[PDB]
Design goal:
part of a larger assembly; 3 chains; alpha/beta; M1 Pyruvate Kinase, Domain 3; 3 domains; 8-stranded parallel barrel; binds 1,6-di-O-phosphono-beta-D-fructofuranose; binds potassium ion; binds magnesium ion; glycolysis (chain C); Pyruvate kinase PKM (chain C)
C-alpha cells in the first residue's frame, strides 16, 4: 500500500526501480484541484457533482464574462457547496478564485459569413488594423486587435501569434495604425482569440482600469484568492495589494508567471506574492515551448523552499475537452507536476467548456493520488529540513517535530487546530506522507487551506462551547470523526495532534501522539 | 551553457531551483528519435528532410500493410539515407525497425468502406458477432471481431474497449458466438479498429503464424531491430529469438510492454530481451491510465540499471497530428521521459499520418536536448557506479574509467572504436555528459547504436590498414574530424579515446586522454 | 560548538572545517566512570572527584573484601549527599559493581607480598598447581589459581601475565605442572592476572564467589553490574537470575573481554541492558591490532540498539604517574566519544594513581570538545533512517522532540520520567542539546548516567494532588536547574516532554516552551 517498498530505497534510481502498479494508494489525495467554471460546469447540479468528483477551488476567468455573470456563478458555487453543509463531518469547503484579465491582447469577431471561422494559409498575406470599423469584420485579409500601440512596439520581421500559439505571422510592413504580415504557419481563425507578441516591450499595465473594477468586485463578492495575470515584477504585485486594500487584505494573491520578464524577476515576485501559478498557456508562447518544463520545475522548487503555494496550470488534460480519456502525455504531465511538488493542479477548458468536465476532475484526482504514493518522502523531507533555517519560532519547530513524528509512527493523520491557517501551512511545507486535517472555525482559512498540499480543511460549526481545554478536545474529536468517516484511519490507529497553550493565532506549540478512539 | 550551474548543487531540490531557461544547451543531442513511417512520411523526399530534422530510427508497423508495401518503405529509407553517403563525415546512419502485429484484436469494416463511420451513443445496445458474414458489414447494431474465443474469456459485466480505449462497452449477455453490450461512452466508430479486453485472460499466442512470416521477412530485408508486441513473458521472447534464428541472430529484440502480465513479469523479460519499449498506447488501456507513469518510470529505471536500451513510445506529441505546435502536457511528457532516463523517444501517428511530421521530429529534437542539459549528472553517475557490480571484465572497467575521466576534464567527447557496438554500449550505460562518438566499419552496429543514449554512430568507409596501430590512428582521426565538423569540439579541446590492444570484439582495454588536433 | 563544522555536506568537508578556536558548550554529555581505590577512597577526594566530573563510581570485586567495598560505598554516598542540601546543584552519582569473573591469577613471590623477580628472555619457568608454592613464587617456580590449566593448554601454547607484558611458551605439559620458556620477560609481582588466548578455559562465567558478590550488590543497593568475561547470552541470564526479583532494576552491563564474547556479541547485547568494551583483557585475548575494530563495531551496534556502551581500559594510563596524558591518550578519549560511546572509564588512573583529579578533569575536557566535533546531521539522519517504524507513542514523541530541538536550536530537552525510559528514548537519537531528566526516583536518576546526554535531576518536592501543577512544578524545577548550571537563559527556547497521566509508559506530549 502506498509504495512503502519504493520509499525505503537508498537511491533515486533504486526507488524508481521499486515502483509497483499493483501497490494501491491511500484514500487521501493531497494535491488540490482547481477547476475553471464556464458553460459546461456553471449549473448548480453539475457543481454538486464536481465537488463530489474532487473540485477544491473554483476559478472564475475575468478575461470573459460580465460582473453579473460571475456574480451568478459564485452564487451557484456557494449553493452547491452549502448543499452539503447539513453534515459538517462530510462537508468539504470550496474556495472561490478570481483570475484577472490582465494586459491581454485579443482579436475581433469574424464576418459571420456562413461558418464563422476563416482558413489562413501558409504564405498568404494578412493585414492587421486598429481601425474600429473592422472589429467585427475580421477575415483572411483584414484582422482587428485590442492593442492600441501595437505598431509602436513591433518591428518589421517580428513574429505575432494569434491563438494559443497555433497561428504565426511575420510582420513585413509597419504602418501608422496598420500592419502587413505574411502567414507563416496557418490554420482556421476564430473570434476573440488571444494574441501574443514574444520579444516585444508591450506597454500595457499589469493592472488596467477594468482589472481594478474586477478586483474591487472580488472584494465585494468575498472571494478567497486572486490569480493575477502577467505579473512582470514585485511592483505589479504591490499594485494589486493596494487595490484589494484593507477590506481585501486577507485575500491571497497568487501571481501568474506567463512571460519572460516574470521568470527573470521570479524571486522578487515570489517574495511579494502569497503564492505562484505556473501559467503554461501564455508562458509556452512567450518563451520557447521546449524551455517551459525548466521554468515549471524551477518555480515549483523555489516555492517549496519558500513554503508558499504553487499551482501547475494549463493544458494538463486538453484531450479531454473532446474525449472521455486523456492521452498518455497528459497522464504523464499531471503525475510529474505532483512529483515536481505542485500544491495544486488546474483545469481550464477541460471543465469550463468541454464535453467531459467530471471525467477530467476525476482523472486528476486519480493520478494525483497515485503520484503522491510514488513520492520519495525520505529524500524530500530530508532535503527540506536540511534547507530549513534554524529559528526560535515555536510553531515552526513544533511543525517539523510533528512531521518527523508522523513518519516515525506512520500516523494516519496530523490533526492541527488553526485559526488563521498558518499552523497547518507550516506542517504542509515539510511535506508529510500523512494527511493534515486542519480544524478551524474561520470559514475563509478553511477555503484558503486548499492552496497548500496535504491540508484537508474542516470547518467546525460548533460554538465555543465550554472551557478552552474541552473546546480543544471537542475540536480534536471532531477531526477524529472526520478521519474515521472519510476513511483516513480507524479506531486504534495512531495520530499526531497540534494544539496551542491558549486561544489566538501564533500560540501553537504542543504536539501529542494520540490513539484514535 | 548546458546548466553547469544546476548540476553542481548538493540536493535535488537545489538542483531544481537552479534551473535556468536562459542557459542554452550543447549542440549534441543524445536521446535517440524513432519515427513511425506511413502515408505522411513514406516519400524519399520527406524521408531526406526527416533524417535532417533528427530521425535516427525508422519504425515499420506490421499491424498494417503488406510485405510488398513495407519492402518499398525500406527501399526509400535506404535511398534517402544513402543520399548523404557521399560525405562520410556528415553521414548519419539510420536504423530500420520492424514492429510486429502481435496478438491484437481488431474490428471489421463498416460498409465495405475503408473510411465511412457510425455514431455510437451512450446507453445504446450493440451486438458483437464472430459470424464471418458480418466482417465487412459492421454498424451501430452489429460489430464483428478477429478474436475467436472472445466469448470464452469474457464475463457479463466485463468492459470492452474499441479505438485506443475511446469507445467503451459493457457486456450484458454472453452468447456462444455473440455478445450483447451496452455502449457506456460512445463516439464515432471506424473500420479495422483495435480492441482491448483488460482483466481478461486472452489466449492468443505472442507469436502468430503471420508474426513468424513477418519476422522471417525482417531477416530477409536486413532489419536492424524488432519491436515485439504484447510480450507477456520470457518464453515469448525466446520464441522470437528462435524464429529470427542464426541468420537473424544479430537483430536486436526490443520487447514491448503493453499489458498487465508483461509488467508483472518484467524482470524475466528484460533478461531475455536486448531492450524494452514502454508501449503506453495499449498499456494505458490494459491497466488504469493513472498507473502508467509508475510502470514507465519503473521500467526505465530497471533498464538503466541493467544497461539495456529503453524506449518511451506512444502519444508523446498527439496534438501535433493536426496542429503545428504541441500542448504544454506534451512538451512536459517528452522532457520528463528523457529525465526519467529513456534512451529513445518515439513518434507514431505524429509522423506516420499527421499533417506535421517534420515539426514533430524537430520538436522532439529540441526538447530532448534541453532535458539532457537539465540532467543532474553527479547524482546519476554516482548512483550508477555505486550500483555497478564489481567484475573483472576489462572493457567494463575501462568504460567506467573513461566516463569518470570525461567528467573530470569536461571532455568534448568520448571516442570509442567498436566492431560489435558493445564497447560503446558499455560507456553509454554510465551516462556521460559528453557525447560518445562510436567509430565502426560494421554498418549494422552503426545503425543499432542509435538504441543507446549518447552514442553518435560513425561509419568508417576507409579500408583496413595493415599496421593495426595506424589503422587505429586513422579511425581515431576520422572521429576527430567528425566532432570538429558537427561542432562537438574544437582544436585544442580535450577528448577521451577508447581502443583495444588488438583486432576483434572483446579486446577494448585502453583509455587515452588526448588533445584535439 | 563548531556549528560551522556540522553544516558541511561531506564528512571530509566537515573534517576540514574543524576549528580549535571555536569553544564548546558548558554541557558535557559523555558519562565518566571512575574506579575507586587507595587514591580516591577518602570522602574528601570523592567530593573533589564529583566536582571534577565523576558520574559513576566503579567497585572492582577482583580485589578487596565485602567489608572494604561496603565502606567505599558508604563514603561515595557521604560525599554525594554532602551536596544534597541544594537540589538544584545536586549531581546524582551511581554505584557500579564490577565482578571478579573467571579470572586466573598467580600467587605471591616471597613472605613479602610486594617484592619482585626478574624473568629473562630464554630462561625456563616451571608452573605448578601444587598449593605448597602458592606463596613461594620465584624465577623458577610459579603457582596459579586455575586447576584445569594442564587440560586446556598444549605444548607450544602461549601464556601471558601482568596485562600481557610477560609471555611464556609451554614446552612440556605435565599432570599438575608445566615447563615453559620465557619469551619476553620483565619483573614479576604478586597476584598477577593470567591470560590464555586460543584456549577453551572451562571456568564458569558466574562462580560461587561471584554469586555472593552479586547478592551483596543487591543488599548494598548498587545501581548497575559490570559482568566480567561474558561469553554468551546464557551467561547474562545466570546473572539476571542471581540478582533476582529484588535486584531486577539493577542494570546489567556485559563486559566483552574475549574472543567468544565478540563472536556472539549480538546474542549478548540482546540479553544485556548495556555493554562495556573491556580493552584490558580483550587486547590480550585477541590480537592488539584488532581491538579498535571490535571497539567500533560494538559501539555502533549498541547505538543502533539504543543500549548504553562504555569504552573502558587504559584511556589515560600515562596519568597514573604523570600530571598530563600522552598525545595517543588524548586521541583515544576523543575518538571513543566520536565512535559514539555513552561513557568513558578510568581504572588505575583513579583507583591508585598519583593524579586522580587531573585524569577525571582531562576526560571531562576532551569529551566536551569531542562532542562539539560531532557531525550531528549525518548521525541523527542515519539513526532516524535506521529507526524501525513503530506505533509506540513515546518512541515517536522522542524522535519528534530531538528533531524539534535541532530545528530551534533548543537550550535543552526537558523530560519527566519515572523509570528513565522516556529520557533513554530521547538519548538514543543523539541530540545536540542536553537532556534534563526530571525524576522522583533516585535510582533512575543515578542510572541515567549510562546514557549519553542525560543530566539526571532528582526532584525532592512532594507530589501535588493536581497532577497538572505537579508537572508544572517539576518542569519549572528543571527550568531553574538549566539556568543555574548555565545551559540556557530566560528567553531561550526549550523542548518539554510530559505524559497525559501518571505512571511509566504514558509519555506522549511535546511542547516548545520559552524559558521564564
Ligand atoms: O519515562 P517513564 O518511566 O516511562 O515515565 C514517563 C511518565 O512521566 C510522566 O510524564 C509524569 O508522571 P509521573 O509523575 O508518574 O512520572 C507520565 O505522564 C509518564 O507516563
Ligand atoms: K485570465
Ligand atoms: K503493432
Ligand atoms: K574485575
Ligand atoms: Mg493566460
Ligand atoms: Mg500496441
Ligand atoms: Mg579485565
Amino acid at each position: 500500500t502506498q509504495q512503502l517498498h519504493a520509499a525505503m530505497a537508498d537511491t533515486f534510481l533504486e526507488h524508481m526501480c521499486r515502483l509497483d502498479i499493483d501497490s494501491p494508494p491511500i484514500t487521501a489525495r493531497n494535491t488540490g484541484i482547481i477547476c475553471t467554471i464556464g458553460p459546461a460546469s456553471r449549473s448548480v447540479e453539475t457543481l454538486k457533482e464536481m465537488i463530489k468528483s474532487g473540485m477544491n477551488v473554483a476559478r472564475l476567468n475575468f478575461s470573459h464574462g460580465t460582473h453579473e455573470y460571475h456574480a451568478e456563478t459564485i452564487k451557484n458555487v456557494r449553493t452547491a457547496t452549502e448543499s452539503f453543509a447539513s453534515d459538517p463531518i462530510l462537508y468539504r469547503p470550496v474556495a472561490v478564485a478570481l483570475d484577472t484579465k490582465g494586459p491581454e491582447i485579443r482579436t475581433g469577431l469574424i464576418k459571420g459569413s456562413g461558418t464563422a471561422e476563416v482558413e489562413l494559409k501558409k504564405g498568404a498575406t494578412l493585414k492587421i488594423t486598429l481601425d474600429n470599423a473592422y472589429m467585427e469584420k475580421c477575415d483572411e485579409n483584414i484582422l482587428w486587435l485590442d492593442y492600441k500601440n501595437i505598431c509602436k512596439v513591433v518591428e518589421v520581421g517580428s513574429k505575432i501569434y494569434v491563438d494559443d500559439g497555433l497561428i504565426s505571422l511575420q510582420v513585413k510592413q509597419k504602418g501608422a495604425d496598420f500592419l502587413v504580415t505574411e502567414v507563416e504557419n496557418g490554420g482556421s481563425l476564430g473570434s476573440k482569440k488571444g494574441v501574443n507578441l514574444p520579444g516585444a516591450a508591450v506597454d500595457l499595465p499589469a493592472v488596467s482600469e477594468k482589472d481594478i473594477q474586477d478586483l474591487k468586485f472580488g472584494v465585494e463578492q468575498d472571494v478567497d484568492m486572486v490569480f493575477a495575470s502577467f505579473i512582470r515584477k514585485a511592483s505589479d504585485v504591490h499594485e494589486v495589494r493596494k487595490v484589494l486594500g484593507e477590506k481585501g487584505k486577507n485575500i491571497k494573491i497568487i501571481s501568474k508567471i506567463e512571460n519572460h520578464e516574470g521568470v527573470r524577476r521570479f524571486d522578487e515576485i515570489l517574495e511579494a506574492s502569497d503564492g505562484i501559478m505556473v501559467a503554461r498557456g501564455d508562458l509556452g508562447i512567450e518563451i520557447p515551448a521546449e524551455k517551459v518544463f525548466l521554468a515549471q520545475k524551477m518555480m515549483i522548487g523555489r516555492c517549496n523552499r519558500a513554503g508558499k503555494p504553487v499551482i501547475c496550470a494549463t493544458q494538463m488534460l486538453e484531450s479531454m475537452i473532446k474525449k472521455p480519456r486523456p492521452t498518455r502525455a497528459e497522464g504523464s504531465d499531471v503525475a510529474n507536476a505532483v512529483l515536481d511538488g505542485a500544491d495544486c493542479i488546474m483545469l481550464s477548458g477541460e471543465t469550463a467548456k468541454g464535453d467531459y468536465p467530471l471525467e477530467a476532475v476525476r482523472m486528476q484526482h486519480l493520478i494525483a493520488r497515485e503520484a503522491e504514493a510514488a513520492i520519495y518522502h525520505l529524500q524530500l523531507f530530508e532535503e527540506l529540513r536540511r534547507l530549513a533555517p534554524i529559528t526560535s519560532d515555536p510553531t515552526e519547530a513544533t511543525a517539523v517535530g510533528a512531521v518527523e513524528a508522523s513518519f516515525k509512527c506512520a500516523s494516519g493523520a496530523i490533526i492541527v487546530l488553526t485559526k488563521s491557517g498558518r499552523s497547518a501551512h507550516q506542517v504542509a511545507r515539510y511535506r508529510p506522507r500523512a494527511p493534515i486535517i486542519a480544524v478551524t472555525r474561520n470559514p475563509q482559512t478553511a477555503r484558503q487551506a486548499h492552496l497548500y498540499r496535504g491540508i484537508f480543511p474542516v470547518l467546525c460549526k460548533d460554538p465555543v462551547q465550554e472551557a478552552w481545554a474541552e473546546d480543544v478536545d471537542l475540536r480534536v474529536n471532531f477531526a477524529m470523526n472526520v478521519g474515521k468517516a472519510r476513511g483516513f484511519f480507524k479506531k486504534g490507529d495512531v495520530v499526531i495532534v497540534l494544539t496551542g497553550w491558549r486561544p489566538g493565532s501564533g500560540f501553537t506549540n504542543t504536539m501529542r501522539v494520540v490513539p484514535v478512539p
